[PDB]
């Protein structure tokens, strides 16, 4: 098609949008997260800080149920006592920063639940192969 | 067996060989890719450059259909308009640098096709698990 336009859907462009809008574009935001006489030491410190953060996040994901995937389902049920808001209003209406400031108290508990469920899945997978 | 020789199949040793020859030895070439008062700053800059490149390649692989594997099939059909050369002549005759200089124009399009196919596979896997 001659006469072809383009919108350059850039890095960090679904902030105010709903969850299901940002779920499509999150991959490019994950992609742009990485690359980017004393001034070289400062830029070096900033660069190795950036890779310290990226490696921390990759390790923190890796002990959970997914190694390098970006979408990950697990076997831990959502405790309703945390936020008690149903599917449509959190998937269509609510933004991301609002969702961050809504459950910024039970985050570590969710981390521990994921880790415990993945470790018991590891031992169950190791014992499923025990009889074989 | 007494009297046992050895050829030390070292790093970067299948350059002029065919694709199927280098496909066996690629694992050691991937293994050797990583390790390796102002001179410490230069060597430090070179070392963190090397890990910047390695982490860029690991992230670029990870958003595709494989996380840490070295051989990877996907669900994107090979567009024949790119190179229109059949299986035997590209798997038995052609070298690697020739193969680089043959399709060094459609590489980014291949990257985008892989990323789009993997992301729609992500949403299809998430929706296959929706009804369960």
């Amino acid at each position, epitope marked *: 098609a001659v006469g072809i336009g383009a919108v350059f859907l850039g890095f960090l462009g679904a902030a105010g949008s709903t969850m299901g809008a940002a779920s499509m*574009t999150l*991959t490019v935001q994950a992609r742009n997260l990485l690359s980017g006489t004393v001034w070289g030491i400062k830029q070096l410190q900033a660069r190795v800080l950036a890779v310290e953060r990226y490696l921390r996040d990759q390790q923190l994901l890796g002990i959970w149920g997914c190694s390098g995937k970006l979408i990950c389902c697990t076997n831990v049920p959502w405790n309703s006592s945390w936020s008690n808001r149903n599917l449509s209003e959190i998937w269509d209406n609510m933004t991301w920063l609002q969702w961050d400031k809504e459950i910024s108290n039970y985050t570590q508990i969710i981390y521990g639940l994921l880790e415990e469920s993945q470790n018991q899945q590891e031992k169950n997978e190791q014992d499923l192969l025990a009889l074989d | 067996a007494v009297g046992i020789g050895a050829v030390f199949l070292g790093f970067l040793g299948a350059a002029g060989s065919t694709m199927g020859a280098a496909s066996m030895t690629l694992t050691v070439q991937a293994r050797n890719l990583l390790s390796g008062t102002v001179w410490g700053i230069k060597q430090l800059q070179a070392r963190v450059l090397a890990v910047e490149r390695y982490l860029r390649d690991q992230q670029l692989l990870g958003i595709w259909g494989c996380s840490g594997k070295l051989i990877c099939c996907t669900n994107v059909p090979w567009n024949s308009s790119w190179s229109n050369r059949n299986l035997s002549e590209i798997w038995d005759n052609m070298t690697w640098l020739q193969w680089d200089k043959e399709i060094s124009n459609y590489t980014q399009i291949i990257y985008g096709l892989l990323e789009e196919s993997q992301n729609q596979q992500e949403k299809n896997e998430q929706d296959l698990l929706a009804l369960d």
Partner: antibody
Amino acid sequence: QVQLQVSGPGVVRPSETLSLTCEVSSGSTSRDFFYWSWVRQTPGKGLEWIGGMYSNSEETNHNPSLKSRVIISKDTSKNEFSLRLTSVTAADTAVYFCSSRAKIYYSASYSGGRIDVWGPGLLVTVS
Amino acid sequence: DIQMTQSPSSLSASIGDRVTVTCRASQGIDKDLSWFQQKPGKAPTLLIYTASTLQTGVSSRFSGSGSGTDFSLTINNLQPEDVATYFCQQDFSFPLTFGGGTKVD
């Protein structure tokens, strides 16, 4: 007004200059570019594209069936897409739409989707 | 210019019929055909871009087939919101030529 809302005079005197404006907007990026286009809907014929121009450049691409009688201009600072059709006869009595022409691509390689939505038109009568 | 002929001008069907709009071209526009829905009095809104890809927002009822010069829009389970004039748009070469218009009653 809504996006791609065409406003201006609804009655053009015979053989004078029709001049219509349209509420356009910039993209989400400074790197973005639109093609704004004038299209007419006639009762006699179907939808007829009048012309248009890139938001990046100042070159005008138009339909030569109107025989280069258009002056297609824009002002991104003032949200203005403007048609100055000259020598307007009663054949140009039509409902004019102004259209945004762009693609929705997601990541820097591929195409991912094209959006060519139109805004509600303005009937211009020539008598 | 490239002539675009859309057929029919009007087609009548009951609630739930799979109808078909045929758009033919004079020249090779191979997959540069758009399908638009226009309420009477309102602006045309997009249904199909690149003649086979469903646009996000409209339902899966609007499907598209065909290639080259000949394309066919297909409406499975015809709805009361489908009362609209449909237009097939060529965007292969200058100028932009559009369809004749297909009314649903």
